[PDB]
């Protein structure tokens, strides 16, 4: 019975670790048209049918907010954005003082005080020649110099550059694969909570496609909740942590710019072409977004029914307007059509829930110069796009903040917030983890090595 | 009794594939002096002993115009060019205007208007002071503002130049395959643009290669073995350029009779500018030199070869170029560190039929170089003092066949093929890269011994 | 009966070669703060047990003045400094002319005319606007165009400064041979730079060495074991510098007697610039004090060591340098984040024949052309407050004057503006070899016929 420990190689092993992700795209389908920032110049093509393997007898812990792929890919997209803007054109000579007047032609009454026409002293392509250049601007990007002449917001700060209009900003569903010697695990739970074991476990070598959508309060055109509306957070007690929401059923979002915008081209220097807004044809109409109301409270009723599980089942649940702060979390933003939108979700949550004709509109704002991410050391100017844009988009989740100071476990209210897109990527990738497989192994048995 | 397959490793197999290549220099003989663009003044040298190995009983299929080594080498040459140009200074400020007057006195009556004296009111190396410089300019490099003139390329991408000690002359550059790859070449005396090669050979690494830039006549290429050779993707198609190579050298001479001087100009701190100074002596146009009887004999051989694939009674013609941009109208080469432009119509003014000793060519100089077809790059050559004199060989021609020519008679050709990928294919027409699979199997009488 | 040569593996062999070494820092001690210029953010931590063994009855020939790790090291400092400088800002707009005035705030009479009020029209946060802001500069970094001055180095390579959070303090660097290579050292404490070493030993990684920046005297590194020793490629040719290594340290204080004030300006977006502000209090010349007794007795030790290779009873003199480029002219070093320049002339006014402190002035410059290169330059950021510096002097680099007669009355001057000496003064113990584990030898082997 004097057993000997003996070598075994190639045995499956799980051990948590971190390695660099591998890009992946379905047969490089993005090559059909050029060009996209997220698809980049190139990424590796992949098999359209990765082999899903569901594991019998296997349960495994899956913990959100402890994942590191999330911030790794956060770095990946910030680097991609910087690299994409790198070959483009700097725009510093554009922020001399501007002589402006109020635009009042063919404009709706609520639309006054928004569109502005400015002229300024900017040279020509030639070294010694100056040209007079005019374009239509929005107030949200310009500030007064004195208490008139006007200047845009961001020449206190880092330099300004232009987005190259030859590459689109539309998101691309992105696949990810593990390095050699690794695999990605998929939790098969339908009602899985944020932490703890997953009684049904499966694995992949590559993950499905994820759209790098940028939104601040509303999960847009992502995945659906498979059975019921889902709520997640690190700790419900801690109000400083954000509240994830995942919808069982989506309702579309329609967002268009009714005004027919026009564009002009200006020269700065050798190989420096600038694009700016021309005169607008038609009556100036504010951008809006419409969504059905009946679906809206039905979904909030489901959300509140799920909410009451984690509180007293006889409290009062109310929703409200954002507490304030900077506009990026004060309002909702999205990129539809290659340009950004700022809409007021204040009236979205105007309702109160007690124990026991069809679509509503939201006015929206438009911004050209954008402090992308939270970054303060860089800035960009969005190129104007002519015509009339249109966006159709689902809704796939909410992101919420819970008020503090509550007592007696009654009268709970919630507000949108937490512009950390890390939350968005958690709400996308939260079905996967990275694990290292150790082929080595030494176990006792009855084998004694043959005598020399 | 039934045979079993067994395993072989290290067996010879070639497969069509593609991989990146390496530098290989002639023992780094240039290391004694600085600087050359094409060698970066340094890469891995090579031994003088690669052994060509004839492949008896072996035939091989080759194909030009689809093998990619030519294009990879083209993009490598572009990368070498802009890499050698990156560390040296730009020339942004000169897109200013120019007041100009014609160069007068001590001039040939035929050059009148070629050179222009323009001055600048530009600033100094110190940012608060203004100065006045003057320089000499070719007429081709400048365009009038509306006398006053402006540089032709300031409504396109900026032009960069500095840093003149660097040389442009070629060095023989080789390319050795990566481990697991080899080089194959075709041994026959005469070979089409495509087809099997009855006798083939393999080498570890290629011979000396020149990256020389030619527009309308091949220069310094290896001589044809037996006779004038004609190639193209398909002779019938008239969108494809035709290849011509010479069995016997045709020698040319080119020189710049003017004694030129160079001035040092300062515009920005740590930035040296060089412009052509006042020319010493009488102004005389630069020219080239080619023999008469030789040119007759070469064109006679060319038309005799052309008679093979066409009706033997067809009338052959060559002519004046068709026009367009100078890079294909004229003939251009950089010999002597200077780009030369001139006009081969004097050499193609002829026509053949069935069954003193030299010619002069008026030639031009351009200081602004939109090298290749790029629009985002530009360079201004440095003025070279003294008188430059060039000796060279001509070994090939690139022509285009005009349309029409109905009823199979009166065939004409005009110069073309302004893409130097044709030059590099006309060099590399000999070499192909293949893929080695050391693995393999085969049947045998052997079965694995038990235990 | 006849032998048969047979292959053996694992055979230890040494042979001269060269590769690139491994960066090694002591247990990543610098990771606590961001970040040293040399250590940067990343290298391999050292082995906590740098095991050393004495070679059993082995002697080896060492050839210093022929080592190549010294030049590899020199290139490595060059690369590290350029890498640190690269993600920083350019100061070309400062090349505009500066009007300057001679302003003193209770200055000392020996300090008059060294610090100037200079100002320029500068740029603003907007290219449309200009504003005049003054600053204070040393007399070294300016020049009269024909008062009005300009930066001394605007007729050469550009001036670049930024990134003040880097630390200029050296850290010892270990170096480990790559796989298949080894490092060999000489135990003999009296060993030359060259010649065979009777007592040799091998190490995996050489001991940590500070990237000491000095020109005239070696600072703040290793000591000679049992006496001072002197080395030179050939004691005959005068073109070679004379190395001196001390066995006992010499303590040094150097200080700047005034606090410093710093103001920041924004020449452009992301282009904050730090300049010297007004200095309060009395203006006193920076200088150094050092004990006299140690100086003269250590010089006596050095003369006793030096007399060995001459025929004795020969006069030995040291003297004021002959001048030249300021880098070799004055003793320069950095401490407290500021570069120094000191006149060691007063240290050597004495001759030698058979049978409690000293002061010396110094100087400060802010535009430094690193090493002998002229294509790169840097502006030092002002360091706030009073700089206090303590250090040990571990050696001296010397040069011998040519001429004289009768092999008598030998005179010496400091020299050797090549910091290669600074690195080799400690790299001269170590040497690298290649190991070929394969080996063959005859034996009675006859492989079993099958």
């Amino acid at each position: 019975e004097n057993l000997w420990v003996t070598v075994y190689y190639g045995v499956p092993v799980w051990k948590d670790a971190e390695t660099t992700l591998f890009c992946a795209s379905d047969a490089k389908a993005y090559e059909t048209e050029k060009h996209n920032v997220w698809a980049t110049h190139a990424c590796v093509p992949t098999d359209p049918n990765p082999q899903e393997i569901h594991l019998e007898n296997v349960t495994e812990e899956f913990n959100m907010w402890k994942n590191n792929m999330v911030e790794q890919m956060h770095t990946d997209i910030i680097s991609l954005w910087d690299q994409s803007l790198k070959p483009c054109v700097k725009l510093t000579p554009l922020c001399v003082t501007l002589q402006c007047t109020n635009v009042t032609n063919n404009i709706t009454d609520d639309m006054r005080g928004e569109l502005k026409n400015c002229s300024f002293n900017m040279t020509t392509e030639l070294r010694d020649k100056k040209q007079k250049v005019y374009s239509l601007f929005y107030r949200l990007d310009v500030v007064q110099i004195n208490e008139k002449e006007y200047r845009l917001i961001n020449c206190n700060t880092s330099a300004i550059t232009q987005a190259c209009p030859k590459v689109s900003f539309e998101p691309i569903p992105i696949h990810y694969c593990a390095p050699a010697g690794f695999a990605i695990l998929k939790c098969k739970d339908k009602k899985f909570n944020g932490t703890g074991p997953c009684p049904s476990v499966s694995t992949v070598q590559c993950t499905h496609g994820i759209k790098p959508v940028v939104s601040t309060q509303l999960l847009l055109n992502g995945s659906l909740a498979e059975e019921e509306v889902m709520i997640r957070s690190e700790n419900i007690t801690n109000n400083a942590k954000n509240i994830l929401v995942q919808f069982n059923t989506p309702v579309q979002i329609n967002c268009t710019r009714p005004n027919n915008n026009t564009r002009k081209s200006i020269r700065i220097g050798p190989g420096q072409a600038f694009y700016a807004t021309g005169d607008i044809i038609g009556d100036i109409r504010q951008a809006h977004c419409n969504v059905s109301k009946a679906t809206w409270n039905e979904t909030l009723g489901k959300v509140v029914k799920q909410l009451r599980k984690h509180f007293g089942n006889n409290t009062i649940i109310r929703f409200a307007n954002s507490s304030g702060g900077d506009l990026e979390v004060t309002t909702h933003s999205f990129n539809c059509g290659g340009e950004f939108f700022y809409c007021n979700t204040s009236g979205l949550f105007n309702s109160t829930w007690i124990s026991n004709n069809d679509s509503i509109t939201l006015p929206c704002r438009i911004k050209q110069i954008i402090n992308m991410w939270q970054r303060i050391g860089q800035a960009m100017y969005a190129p104007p796009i002519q015509g009339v844009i249109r966006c159709v988009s689902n809704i796939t989740g909410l992101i919420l903040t819970r008020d503090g100071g509550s007592t007696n476990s009654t009268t709970e209210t919630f507000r949108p917030g937490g512009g950390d897109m890390r939350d968005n990527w958690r709400s996308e990738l939260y079905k996967y983890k990275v694990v290292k497989i150790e082929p080595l192994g030494v176990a006792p048995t009855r084998c004694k090595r043959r005598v020399v | 009794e039934n045979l079993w397959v067994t395993v072989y490793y290290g067996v010879p197999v070639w497969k069509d594939a593609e991989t990146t290549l390496f530098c290989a220099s002639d023992a780094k003989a240039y290391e004694t002096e600085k600087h050359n663009v094409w060698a970066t003044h340094a890469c891995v040298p090579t031994d003088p002993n690669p052994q060509e190995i004839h492949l008896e009983n072996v035939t091989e299929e080759f194909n030009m115009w689809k093998n990619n080594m030519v294009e990879q080498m083209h993009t490598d040459i572009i990368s070498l060019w802009d890499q050698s140009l990156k560390p040296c200074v730009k020339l942004t400020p000169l897109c200013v205007t120019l007041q100009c007057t014609n160069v007068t006195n001590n001039i040939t009556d035929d050059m009148r208007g070629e050179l222009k004296n323009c001055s600048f009111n530009m600033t100094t190396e110190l940012r608060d002071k203004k100065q006045k410089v003057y320089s000499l300019f070719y007429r081709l490099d400048v365009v009038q503002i509306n006398k006053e003139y402006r540089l032709i390329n300031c409504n396109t991408s900026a032009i960069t130049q500095a840093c003149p000690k660097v040389s442009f002359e070629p060095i023989p550059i080789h390319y050795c395959a990566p481990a697991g790859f080899a080089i194959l070449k075709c041994k026959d005396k005469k070979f089409n643009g495509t087809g099997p090669c009855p006798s083939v050979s393999t080498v570890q690494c290629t011979h000396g290669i020149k990256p020389v830039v030619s527009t309308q006549l091949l220069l310094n290429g290896s001589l044809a073995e037996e006779e004038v050779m004609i190639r193209s993707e398909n002779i019938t198609n008239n969108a494809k350029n035709i290849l011509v190579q010479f069995n016997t050298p045709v020698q040319i001479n080119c020189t710049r009779p003017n004694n030129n001087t160079r001035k040092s100009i300062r515009i920005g701190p740590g930035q040296a500018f060089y412009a052509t100074g006042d020319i010493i002596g009488d102004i005389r146009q630069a020219h080239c030199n080619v023999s008469k009887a030789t040119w007759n004999e070469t064109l006679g051989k060319v038309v005799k070869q052309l008679r093979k694939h066409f009706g033997n009674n067809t009338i052959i013609r060559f002519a004046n170029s068709s026009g367009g941009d100078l890079e294909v109208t004229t003939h251009s080469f950089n010999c002597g560190g200077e780009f030369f432009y001139c006009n081969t119509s004097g050499l193609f003014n002829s026509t053949w039929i069935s069954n003193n000793d030299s010619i002069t060519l008026p030639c031009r100089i351009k200081q602004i170089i939109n090298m290749w077809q790029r629009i985002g790059q530009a360079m201004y050559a440095p003025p070279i003092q003294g008188v430059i004199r060039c000796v060279s060989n001509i070994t090939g021609l690139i022509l285009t066949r005009d349309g029409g020519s109905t009823n199979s008679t009166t065939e004409t050709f005009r110069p073309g093929g302004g893409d130097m990928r044709d030059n590099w294919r006309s060099e590399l027409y000999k070499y192909k890269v293949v893929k080695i699979e050391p693995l393999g199997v085969a049947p045998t009488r052997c079965k694995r011994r038990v235990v | 009966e006849n032998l048969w040569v047979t292959v053996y593996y694992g055979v230890p062999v040494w042979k001269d070669a060269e590769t690139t070494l491994f960066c090694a820092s002591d247990a990543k001690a610098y990771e606590t703060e961001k970040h040293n210029v040399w250590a940067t953010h990343a290298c391999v931590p050292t082995d906590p047990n740098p095991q050393e063994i004495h070679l059993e009855n082995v002697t080896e020939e060492f050839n210093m003045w022929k080592n190549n790790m010294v030049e590899q090291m020199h290139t490595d400092i060059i690369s590290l400094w350029d890498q640190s400088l690269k993600p920083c800002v350019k100061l070309t707009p400062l090349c505009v002319t500066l009007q300057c005035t001679n302003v003193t705030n209770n200055i000392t009479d020996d300090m008059r005319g060294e610090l100037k009020n200079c100002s320029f029209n500068m740029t603003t946060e907007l290219r449309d606007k200009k504003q005049k802001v003054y600053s204070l500069f040393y007399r070294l970094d300016v020049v009269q165009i024909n008062k009005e001055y300009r930066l001394i180095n605007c007729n050469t390579s550009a001036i670049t400064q930024a990134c003040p959070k880097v630390s200029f303090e050296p850290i010892p660097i270990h170096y480990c041979a790559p796989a298949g290579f080894a490092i060999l050292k000489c135990k003999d404490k009296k060993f030359n730079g060259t010649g065979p070493c009777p007592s040799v030993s091998t190490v995996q990684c050489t001991h940590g060495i500070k990237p000491v920046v000095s020109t005239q005297l070696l600072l703040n590194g290793s000591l000679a074991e049992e006496e001072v020793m002197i080395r030179s490629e050939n004691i005959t040719n005068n073109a070679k510098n004379i190395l001196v290594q001390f066995n006992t340290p010499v303590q040094i204080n150097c200080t700047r007697p005034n606090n410093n004030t710093r103001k920041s300006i924004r020449i452009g977006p992301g282009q904050a610039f730090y300049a010297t502000g007004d200095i309060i209090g009395d203006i006193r010349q920076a200088h150094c004090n050092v004990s006299k007794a140690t100086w003269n007795e250590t010089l006596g030790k050095v003369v006793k060591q030096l007399r060995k290779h001459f025929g004795n009873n020969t006069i030995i003199r040291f003297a004021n340098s002959s001048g030249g480029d300021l880098e070799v002219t004055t003793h320069s070093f950095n401490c407290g984040g500021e570069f120094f320049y000191c006149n060691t002339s007063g240290l050597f006014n004495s001759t030698w024949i058979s049978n409690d402190s000293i002061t010396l002035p110094c100087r400060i410059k802010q535009i430094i052309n690193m090493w002998q290169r002229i294509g790169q330059a840097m502006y030092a950021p002002p360091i706030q407050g009073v700089i206090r510096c303590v250090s040990n002097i571990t050696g001296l680099i010397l040069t011998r004057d040519g001429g004289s007669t009768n092999s008598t009355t030998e005179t010496f001057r400091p020299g050797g503006g090549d910091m290669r000496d600074n690195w080799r003064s400690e790299l001269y113990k170590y040497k690298v070899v290649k190991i070929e584990p394969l080996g063959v030898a005859p034996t009675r082997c006859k492989r079993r016929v099958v």
Partner: antibody, heavy 140, light 112 residues
Framework: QVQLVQSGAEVKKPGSSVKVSCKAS????????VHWVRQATGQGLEWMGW????????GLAQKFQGRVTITRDSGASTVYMELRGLTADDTAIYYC?????????????????????????????????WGHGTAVTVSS | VVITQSPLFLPVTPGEAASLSCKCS???????????LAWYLQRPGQTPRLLIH???HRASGVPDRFSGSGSGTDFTLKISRVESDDVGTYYC?????????FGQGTKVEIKR
């Protein structure tokens, strides 16, 4: 209106130097270009000198080079003229006045990594309210 | 650059339109097209006064009877319905090129 004050009439010997003064209420010199104009009875008008309202640029008639100078007090509340080498023919009336100008850029090099090269051109707009003037006569 | 005014003086019949002429050696037009010319009338016994500035528009408070014209090098100043309070001396200035100068002057006087 801004009040202008000038020195009184003076009798001076030939070949000597003469000093004069001027003053404007409210220190309008900061906002208005300084000028100095002579006129002789029965002849046309000639400008002698000028000083910018910023006090940054000055100019003299080429006939008066080496004999005149431009001065002002601290704060530019007053201005003083020194006239040298005067003979009997320089006897005339001397006037202190303000004016308006145009400060416009002529040439410019836009610099990506520094301030633009710039040169300005000063061009007169109009000559503003005159002073009462001063009469200077030269005699033995 | 030199400038001329013509005529030196002219008799005037009261209540009748009249014109004055000023000429210069070089064009007054600026690279931006701006003209730099202002006419000034000086009463004997007092200082001149601006009439028209920069060849386009009369000065503030100037009666409509004044009118200016001309371009480049030649310019004219026409006054309609001249009366007794118009007798005096008229000057054209220079504002394009340093140094700034004035014309030789024209004298308007009632005919007698």
């Amino acid at each position: 209106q801004v009040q202008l004050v000038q020195s009184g009439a003076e009798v001076k010997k030939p070949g000597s130097s003469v000093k004069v003064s001027c003053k404007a209420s409210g220190n309008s010199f900061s906002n208005h270009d300084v000028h100095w104009v002579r006129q002789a009875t029965g002849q046309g008008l000639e400008w002698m000198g000028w000083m910018s309202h910023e006090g940054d640029k000055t100019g003299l008639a080429q006939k008066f080079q080496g004999r005149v100078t431009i001065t002002r007090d601290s704060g530019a509340s007053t201005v003083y003229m020194e006239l040298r080498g005067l003979t009997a023919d320089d006897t005339a009336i001397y006037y202190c006045l303000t004016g308006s100008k145009h400060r416009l850029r002529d040439y410019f090099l836009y610099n990506e990594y520094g301030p633009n090269y710039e040169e300005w051109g000063d061009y007169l707009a109009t000559l503003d309210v005159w002073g009462h003037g001063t009469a200077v006569t030269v005699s033995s | 650059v030199v400038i001329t005014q013509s005529p030196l003086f002219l008799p005037v019949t009261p209540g009748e339109a009249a014109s004055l002429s000023c000429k210069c050696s070089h064009s007054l037009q600026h690279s931006t097209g701006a003209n730099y010319l202002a006419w000034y009338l000086q009463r004997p016994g007092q200082t001149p006064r601006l009439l028209i500035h920069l060849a386009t528009h009369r000065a503030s408070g100037v009666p409509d009877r004044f009118s200016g014209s001309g371009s480049g090098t030649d310019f004219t100043l026409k006054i309609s319905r001249v009366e007794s309070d118009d007798v005096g001396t008229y000057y054209c200035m220079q504002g394009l090129h340093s140094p700034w100068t004035f014309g030789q002057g024209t004298k308007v006087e009632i005919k007698r």
